[PDB]
Amino acid sequence: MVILGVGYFLLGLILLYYGSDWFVLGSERIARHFNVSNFVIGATVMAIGTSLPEILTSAYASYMHAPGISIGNAIGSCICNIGLVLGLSAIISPIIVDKNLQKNILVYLLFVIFAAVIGIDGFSWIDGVVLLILFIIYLRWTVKNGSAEIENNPSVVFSLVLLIIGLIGVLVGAELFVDGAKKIALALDISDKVIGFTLVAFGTSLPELMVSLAAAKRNLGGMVLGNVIGSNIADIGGALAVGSLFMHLPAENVQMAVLVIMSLLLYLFAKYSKIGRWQGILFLALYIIAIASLRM
Ligand SMILES: CCCCCCCCCCCCCCC
Ligand SMILES: [Cl-]
Numbered sequence: 487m488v489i490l491g492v493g494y495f496l497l498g499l500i501l502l503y504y505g506s507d508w509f510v511l512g513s514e515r516i517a518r519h520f521n522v523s524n525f526v527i528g529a530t531v532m533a534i535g536t537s538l539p540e541i542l543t544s545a546y547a548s549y550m551h552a553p554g555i556s557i558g559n560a561i562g563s564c565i566c567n568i569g570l571v572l573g574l575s576a577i578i579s580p581i582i583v584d585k586n587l588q589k590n591i592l593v594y595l596l597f598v599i600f601a602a603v604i605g606i607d608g609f610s611w612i613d614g615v616v617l618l619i620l621f622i623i624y625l626r627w628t629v630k631n632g633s634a635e636i637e638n639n640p641s642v643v644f645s646l647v648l649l650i651i652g653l654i655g656v657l658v659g660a661e662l663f664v665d666g667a668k669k670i671a672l673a674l675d676i677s678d679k680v681i682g683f684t685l686v687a688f689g690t691s692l693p694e695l696m697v698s699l700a701a702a703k704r705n706l707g708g709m710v711l712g713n714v715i716g717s718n719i720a721d722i723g724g725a726l727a728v729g730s731l732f733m734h735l736p737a738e739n740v741q742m743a744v745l746v747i748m749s750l751l752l753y754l755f756a757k758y759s760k761i762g763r764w765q766g767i768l769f770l771a772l773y774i775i776a777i778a779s780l781r782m
């Protein structure tokens with residue numbers, strides 16, 4: 487079963503690599519079909535589609551009476567998306583944010599701060615209902631300001647096929663990757679549960695990572711930023727929220743503070759500067775410091 491672990495691992499990588507490119511390409515075409523910006527398609531369809539692991543993991547964990555894992559998943563993924571995911575992408579393809587998208591990032595920051603404040607004492611099921619609703623409002627507000635009201639085609643059909651098959655590719659690939667790695671570690675008897683549930687946020691962050699990198703290579707910085715901003719909101723208003731429904735989630739004040747600081751930096755760079763190499767390097771530096779000092 488060490489061989490079936492290597493098999494899953496490698497093929498999971500292959501599915502993640504090509505699958506992410508198809509998802510990116512299919513999303514880019516869809517955005518042009520619905521006359522919406524790449525940021526919008528990244529903030530909605532791509533963000534939610536790639537946060538399906540987080541939502542399912544947080545829901546399942548809290549249902550299995552592990553609310554620590556549930557919120558850990560969620561917040562940990564947000565920190566990962568800014569520090570690691572956006573950090574790598576910014577360096578690859580620097581982003582100059584237009585004033586319109588700056589408003590969106592400011593709203594994001596407000597949402598994050600609000601989540602941190604109401605979460606000081608933990609997250610009740612009521613907290614989850616509120617966040618989930620703001621999640622919904624955010625999506626509709628984002629789509630409205632990023633769409634243009636104007637107008638069964640083989641260009642449209644091929645676009646949806648690319649996106650859906652691509653999405654299946656990154657979700658399955660990320661699962662095979664995690665499966666394969668864990669069954670390699672079990673056959674080698676180097677299995678570690680504490681390390682395992684430390685990487686829970688990363689395994690679920692695999693789709694965001696590969697998808698953003700794919701978009702970064704094609705200079706789709708708006709799509710990248712949309713995917714990051716939307717995934718975080720999807721992780722909080724979706725994964726965290728659903729987790730709180732099954733069970734009260736314990737306070738993660740240190741992690742929330744880290745996320746707030748990163749989110750604040752993200753807004754400030756977007757408004758007064760750019761999200762380029764040195765902003766990207768800083769994000770990675772902070773992320774590395776984070777995974778070196780935060781409790782496992
Ligand atoms: C396409 C040209 C890319 C040049 C990339 C330079 C990247 C420097 C990354 C430094 C990361 C530091 C992380 C903390 C040690
Ligand atoms: Cl727990």
Ligand SMILES: [Cl-]
Pocket residue numbers: 524525705706707708709
């Ligand atoms: Cl773009």
Ligand code: NA
Pocket residue numbers: 532533534535536537538694713716717718720
């Ligand atoms: Na996501």
Ligand code: NA
Pocket residue numbers: 536537538539540690691692693694
């Ligand atoms: Na994810």
Ligand code: NA
Pocket residue numbers: 540559562563564566686687688689690691692
């Ligand atoms: Na994640």
Ligand SMILES: [Sr+2]
Pocket residue numbers: 604605606607608609610613
């Ligand atoms: Sr609370």
